Structure 1
Amino acid sequence: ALDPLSETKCTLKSFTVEKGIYQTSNFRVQPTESIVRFPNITNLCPFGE
């Protein structure tokens, strides 16, 4: 977990790595803000009366 060059060596469990392209990991984006999608005040309770 230092560089993407080392991710190919630890995947194949060998230091001798030839040319090519190998899958190492997956890119994930953490959600920074959770927005609750709810409608507006659709009808207040009659507390005034």
Structure 2
Amino acid sequence: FTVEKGIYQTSNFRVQPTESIVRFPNITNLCPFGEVFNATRFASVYAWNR
């Protein structure tokens, strides 16, 4: 209950981060799929492109 003059270490200071970033790449690759819609002509409803 009695403290004399001097320096004293009580606890430690930790800076806890508040946000997290886990993004590994800048962008992912693609596959050719726009030709399904970007086409010269389409198919009918009795025989449609799958």
Identify, as 1 or 2, the structure richer in strand.
Answer: 1
Larger Cα-atom Rg: 2
TM-score, with length taken from structure 2: 0.49
TM-score, with length taken from structure 1: 0.49
Identify, as 1 or 2, the structure richer in helix.
Answer: 1
More relative contact order in 1 or in 2 (CA 8 Å, sep 6+)? Answer: 1
